[PDB]
Amino acid sequence: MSYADSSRNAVLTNGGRTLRAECRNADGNWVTSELDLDTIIGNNDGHFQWGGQNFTETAEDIRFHPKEGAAEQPILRARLRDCNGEFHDRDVNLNRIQNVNGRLVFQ
Numbered sequence: 001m002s003y004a005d006s007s008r009n010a011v012l013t014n015g016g017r018t019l020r021a022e023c024r025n026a027d028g029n030w031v032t033s034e035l036d037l038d039t040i041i042g043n044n045d046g047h048f049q050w051g052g053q054n055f056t057e058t059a060e061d062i063r064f065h066p067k068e069g070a071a072e073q074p075i076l077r078a079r080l081r082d083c084n085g086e087f088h089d090r091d092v093n094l095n096r097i098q099n100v101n102g103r104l105v106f107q
Contacts, residue, residue: 003033003099004066004074014038016062016078019094025102035097035104037076045082048092050106055080060087066094 003023004010008030010021017038022030042052043059056062062078077091096107 001098002074002095003097003104004072004095006099007066007074010064010066010074012037012062012064012076015056016059016064016076017056019064019076019097019104021066021104023099023102023104025099029102031102033099033102033104035106040106041092043080043090045084046080046086046088046090048076048080048090050092050096058082061089064094 007021007023013020019035019037022032025031038056039053041055042049043055058081060079064076066074074094075091076094079087080090081087
């Protein structure tokens, strides 16, 4: 499924630039993994782009929701600024992020 399947203590850090979460590895051990969103997440005029990087420079009000309601769906929403210079709150499915033996990687 995703890293969320075996992740906890998932909170955004650095102002929504770092995704910190504790995910179990292939052995079952809980590993604290951190993925710089700003390193693999981009904002395309109000649209999250997996593999963009530097989205935080055009993103504001970044709030991470690892376990959304009873759905426990990891989604990240923030205000995405467009090339014109406006802002529109968007949301992205962090389910793309999986855990490989104790590491967080986007897919």
